Amino acid sequence: EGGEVVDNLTINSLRQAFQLQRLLERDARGGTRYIEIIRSHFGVISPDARVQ
């Protein structure tokens, strides 16, 4: 008694785990202020004034 049961890995679960890791690595490398997120995850240079 008292084990942990985990299901079979789908390839869809496995590729989602890879793309989630890419997202968290982009957040570490790029920064996590809302302007840094926009500039790292998208091509966009937001003005500072409009983001307070």
């Binding site: 920064g31 996590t32 202020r33 840094e36």
Partner: peptide
Amino acid sequence: ARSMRGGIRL
């Protein structure tokens, strides 16, 4: 002056 690693600090 470009996008630095670890987010911006001047």
